[PDB]
Each structure stands twice: as structure tokens, then as C-alpha cells.
Amino acid sequence: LLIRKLPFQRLVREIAQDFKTDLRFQSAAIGALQEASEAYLVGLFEDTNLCAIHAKRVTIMPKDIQLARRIRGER
DNA sequence: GCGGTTTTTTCGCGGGGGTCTGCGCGTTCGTGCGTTTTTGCGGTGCTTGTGCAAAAGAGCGGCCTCGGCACCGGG
């Protein structure tokens, strides 16, 4: 895993702090969340690279991300 | 639901060195200048055709009196 394990834990807790106050986490929940997040982001970067190559470029730009999320059907 | 075991999460500290960052020059790729090949709406001259004053005689149709006859009623 490329992201670390403690900043990601803090991010997850911060996000979870909105839906219910003072929620405990479990052995393999944060690990699964990190695996899913990194897999998702790698797929998104694959699609972004495809779009950037389509535009005859090598640099990925935010509009490529936006196009990828639009075609995937993401809101 | 309640008691058990014991893993691996949370807690804190020290050290390393890869990653971030200040600084410079160059270039490659982003942006504007100019153009290629073609599509489209703009108009015309000409073709082909349209709706908007008596006088007089001659001739005529209707008509009417009349001629003349056949006919009903009776013996």
C-alpha cells in the first residue's frame, strides 16, 4: 500500500465523525478501506491516462479526470 | 448474554535518509498566424406565363266581328 496507515486512519475517522459520534473501528476495516481506495484510484488513473493519451498528450489534467468520471457515470 | 483466551490495535520515542524544495537554464508543447478545400446562402438576367335623336315605312301578334254551317229537341 502506497498511502501510509496512520494518516489514512485519521482521515477515515475524521470522515466517520459526521455520521455517528465516537465510533470504534475493527482490525480489518481500515485495511480493506485502504485497499479499495487504492484500487479505485489506480483504475481512475488508468482511465485518466487513456484520456490524456487520446488527447495526444502525456500529462494528465483535471479535465481528463472529469471526463473519466462522467463516462463511468460518477457524480 | 456472560465469561474466557490472547491477537493486534493504540501509545510513545529514537534514528535514517528518501522526498520536498530553492534555484538555474533550456526546450517542447501550448497558443496565435495563416492557410486549404469545400459548403452554403446571397443575388441577377432572362424564360414562360397571367388577370384585369328624331322621321318614316314595313312587318308582326293578337284579336274581334262576323259568315255560315250543323246540330238538339220535338212529332
* A44, A65 Cβ separation under 8 angstroms: yes
Q: Determine whether the distance from the CB of A57 to the nearest atom of strand B is below 7 Å.
A: yes
- Other CB atoms within 10 Å distance of the CB of residue A41: 13
Method: cryo-EM
To the nearest 10 degrees (0 to 180), the angle between helices A29-54 and A62-72 is 110
Q: CA dist A38 to A34, A43, A57, Å? A: 6, 9, 24
Helix %, strand %, coil % of chain A (to 5): 65, 0, 35
CA A10 to the chain's CA centroid: 15
* A51, A44 Cβ separation under 8 angstroms: no
Q: Determine whether the distance from the CB of A21 to the nearest atom of strand B is below 7 Å.
A: no
CA distance A13 to A23: 8
Lookup: nucleotide whose C1' is closest to A24 CA: B9
- Other CB atoms within 10 Å distance of the CB of residue A30: 17
Q: Determine whether the distance from the CB of A25 to the nearest atom of strand B is below 7 Å.
A: yes
